[PDB]
Amino acid sequence: GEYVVAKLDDLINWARRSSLWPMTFGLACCAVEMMHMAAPRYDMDRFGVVFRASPRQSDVMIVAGTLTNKMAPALRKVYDQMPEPRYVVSMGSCANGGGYYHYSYSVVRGCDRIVPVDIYVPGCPPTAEALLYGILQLQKKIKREKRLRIWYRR
Amino acid sequence: SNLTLNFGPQHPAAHGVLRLVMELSGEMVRKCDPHIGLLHRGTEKLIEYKTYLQALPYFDRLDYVSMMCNEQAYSLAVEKLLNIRPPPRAQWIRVLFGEITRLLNHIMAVTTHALDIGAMTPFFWMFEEREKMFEFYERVSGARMHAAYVRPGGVHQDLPLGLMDDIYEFSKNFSLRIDELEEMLTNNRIWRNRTVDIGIVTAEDALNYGFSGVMLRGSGIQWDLRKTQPYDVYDQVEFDVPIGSRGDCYDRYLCRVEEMRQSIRIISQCLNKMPPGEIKVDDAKVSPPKRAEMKTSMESLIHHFKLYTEGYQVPPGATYTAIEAPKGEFGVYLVSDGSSRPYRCKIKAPGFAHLAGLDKMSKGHMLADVVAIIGTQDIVFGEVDR
Amino acid sequence: LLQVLKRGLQQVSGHGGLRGYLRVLFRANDVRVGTLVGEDKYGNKYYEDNKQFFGRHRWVIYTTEMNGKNTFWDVDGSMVPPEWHRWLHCMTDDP
Amino acid sequence: MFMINILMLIIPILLAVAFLTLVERKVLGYMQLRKGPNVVGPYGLLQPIADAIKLFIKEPLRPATSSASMFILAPIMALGLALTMWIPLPMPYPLINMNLGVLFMLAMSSLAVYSILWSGWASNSKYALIGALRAVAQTISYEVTLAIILLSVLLMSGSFTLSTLITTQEQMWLILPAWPLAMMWFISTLAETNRAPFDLTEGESELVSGFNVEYAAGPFALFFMAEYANIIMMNIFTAILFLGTSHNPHMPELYTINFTIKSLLLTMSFLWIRASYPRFRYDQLMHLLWKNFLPLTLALCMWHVSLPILTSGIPPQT
Amino acid sequence: MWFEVLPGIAVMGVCLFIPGMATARIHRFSNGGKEKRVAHYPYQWYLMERDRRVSGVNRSYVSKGLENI
Amino acid sequence: MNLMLALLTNFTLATLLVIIAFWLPQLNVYPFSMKFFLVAITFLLFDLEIALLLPLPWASQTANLNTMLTMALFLIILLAVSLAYEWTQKGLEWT
Amino acid sequence: TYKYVNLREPSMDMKSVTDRAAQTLLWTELIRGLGMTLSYLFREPATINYPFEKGPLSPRFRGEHALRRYPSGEERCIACKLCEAVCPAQAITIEAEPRADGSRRTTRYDIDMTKCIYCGFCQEACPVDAIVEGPNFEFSTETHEELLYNKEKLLNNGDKWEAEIAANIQADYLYR
Ligand SMILES: CCCCCCCCCCCCCCCCCC(=O)OC[C@H](COP(=O)(O)OCCN)OC(=O)CCCCCCCCCCCCCCCCC
Ligand code: SF4
Ligand code: SF4
């Protein structure tokens, strides 16, 4: 009953947070720190976060850089093609809320005007370690999901 | 048939996003029409609403692989308009970190070029070296990338005690890392098949198309701004300018690898010739005073107050100042109207003219070659779009 | 090769037997033995080993409970108190 | 007992493929000065399990397919054929001892391109069909040299029975008399399985906007298992062909251990090679086949017809 | 360290070891403790059919020797 | 029989793994080119002559080795001439 | 001064020609590349065990902001607005009035951490070491709103991190 649903949630949550395949939108300088998270010192692959992931095989989108108006429709399209469950990590001030270019005529003031965001990673850029802290924070967010618990009580 | 290239590869990439609209006939590329502006953020307009100091961090975020070199270009332009001179120790520090920045850029340029062509492994080896150089940035400025360290008048702070010893230990082993990279690529027949005779550009065309840096020297043009129009203390260091002979991707790759070796050679002289003294110009109407002075002397407090609110006024005038940035000639056309905010700041990004030549360089090549040609130009769209 | 195997066995003994050895393996994915530098008031334990290369020469084994939260499996970097934050990030040499 | 025997072949294959993914990531990791999976389970031993569960509960991609029949056929053909190539392999005893086992493997592998063709045909995307046609053209091209090389080697064996390759190599590995053919065989298996530096399907689809997966996560995992089952199988076959293991009839398990070790090492060399080289251009790997391997294989096929006759080393027919 | 790659290799090695070991053991179990007879050609098949007749229990692998003379 | 049973199991399992993988996860609610034709045709014509070469391991047992060796070499040479003809006529180009 | 990176004549003597034919046919330079990746397989990796191990940082590191106090507990900030004037991103918003005891103190002090570029100009500009960038970098949040810091949050950051902040300033203030 409730015990079986509770453990199934743990199993599927464990599988999903242990196999987070990211689609990186390397838009600007924040993408450089993202590359350093893949580099040997941090090796995001060792957490199960694969290096190369196709957008249709992805579970998390990382918005790493400034989002311009010219680019916003293309970013939304990639998000819409992501199979679920899908999560968005906003990395850096530009993606978080426009940052240094907040008052620009050509810049989206935060990617959360285009897509829902799960984690906001602050910094300009956030260090590779700060990004990794954010990814680990998303994993614990997935760990708290109770999808089957909610479904059982419907 | 018409075809559009993807915004970016499926692995982490930090060059930005490009919409490449191509015309193909079979395997061959007949037309290339890059559609940019995907990272256009109106930097040049935003600068007009900033003081000269407030605008300096914008230059970290142009070619965001060559941060301190972009800072140097802007600092030199303002110093020229201000008619002041940074102290000798600051100039040596600027050259030292300018060449550390060149190493950072050339690792990114060479290894991501290889990574996009399918040679993934060198990217990982050399980005550990980049991580150690990020630590030098962080130890002088508190930031791994956007240091905002080089400023008009000199540098923000003096090197912490013990930093130069660590830069020596790093430099001592770096040429071995380059050798390992060359072992993987230089003589590899697959690498040579992907680069030799690809994207040939003649010396005459390279000049007329506005090319600079390695895009000129790969074609045999003997030109390097550090040699011909030296700035800071580049006239006081010895190094050789690598020159290509075929004007293709392979020669440009060899030029970049050899430039890394020359950067180590320059860093070695900087570590030994570093002089003592102050690290920013001793003119408190331009460079803020020391914090202890600001908290004790009435004049220092006033000048600190005014430099951080109004900022220094710059005499009216216009300058085009350029440096040999790792990607080529990086310049600023800076217009001062006499106030503390620049009237106009046009940024000359070397990758702008290089990318405009993609259609010319890709003629008679196949689709997979377009990836190689973009890599050999070393394009970052922060500086292209601004 | 036998001396490497001995050091492998020493780690099991150095973590208080198999049960303690397995606990750190599954909590921290690392079974190295270091010198105990100290323990903060929340239960975090700080170790050093200066034969390791720079970066791996200091580490913290997080407490299993902090501020009423069960942190046996769920740990994060914000659990390090500021007085140890400086030492763990090598901003200083003195704990 | 036979149905049990089939299961003791199929199920271990799928588990090996699952854990080849872990091994590939960790071996590539250490050659890249990093670690690879070491959190999900000890030393990453639960990483394949997490990946498997994750992929099968992922939302399935909506299939905008122009042919439902060929859309479901392709993964079935790929996975069924992959499992079928294992049934004549002598390890040291085959599940089915076939007199013409080499021809069976040659004939069954020639059908593998139908899953590539049917999947692209069903994709209902011009970009997917072009990629499928490019992948087929590369596959069939390298089938040519694989067949001729295999025939040349059999002129020292005298038979189409796979178990006879064990007898042929009782004194000496066939890599000694046939290392020029071994080198071209090894590279041809890389190109046949679309492995780096011949991974043009993955390479090209990355560039082209509109050349996507078109299969849901679960069905796409079945394609991946089929591909990796083939990678292990091709390296088991390479070991049998060129590094023959001595068989003791009373201690068959001794053969299995040694032959397993060789197969693992050959499989890891595929990972070793992936970590070391850039990718070929499509026209460049076609030239490698048609203008290099094929001329050399033809001359070596002529040589290996003549050599047993001129040395008086013709093998027995049985 | 590199030897941390071995556990995955060892697991992979075991999975590849099982099919060959199982086939060998199942053959001995089914064939009276001997190798399964190889009959590729009509001669070998004819002798296997004859051995079935001679066994008296309809099993080719049940061998009869001088005791039947 | 054993072979057919093995074939049925392999594809039946493949059919099962595909049917449930196509159906069960649905329960969880939330410019013709002449160059490419000619490589295919060239593969076919080379494949046919590979068919004529397959019996060679059995042909080497003949008492008529003189004829067998001549015809074997003759067949492989005509393959080499076929490749040479395509090569010299730019049938293996991509530009 | 310049040098040629690729201007060499291959020797055409038979020995040299046969060295190149051996390289072509026997893949010697490809084998050499395999040697390099094999040697890396047996090197200790550079990976650290985050979050149990951390990347090294210096006292100058620019992290999360905090508002500081004097040893007596009085706020250091006297609402001069130099940080707000210099901020390149206009991330700082300040209002001030005379405090009930007559002190010059802020009634609003906001930092929009999603506008901020983490440049450290505010702490350079501050004349009384009131606003600093602390050493913390692990403060990612689940909502955008959590990154709009008001004065209470910044004072709480100061009280939370003062032990580390004070030591870092002690380490670097003679370079300023
Ligand atoms: C007594 C008389 C007896 C008669 C017989 C005598 C024989 C004498 C001749 C012996 C030498 C024959 C060698 C045959 C091997 C094939 C050689 C070959 O094809 O190499 C050429 C090919 C293309 O090289 P390229 O530089 O482009 O040449 C210019 C072409 N226009 O280059 C390549 O193929 C390179 C392939 C690139 C991909 C390689 C990636 C992996 C490489 C490492 C694997 C090492 C091999 C491991 C073998 C394992 C076997 C189990
Ligand atoms: S937040 Fe900073 S580092 Fe990131 S893209 Fe914007 S300016 Fe660049
Ligand atoms: S760090 Fe820079 S951008 Fe951030 S609040 Fe201070 S002055 Fe403004």
Ligand code: SF4
């Ligand atoms: S924080 Fe410092 S600079 Fe900013 S208003 Fe307060 S006293 Fe002035």
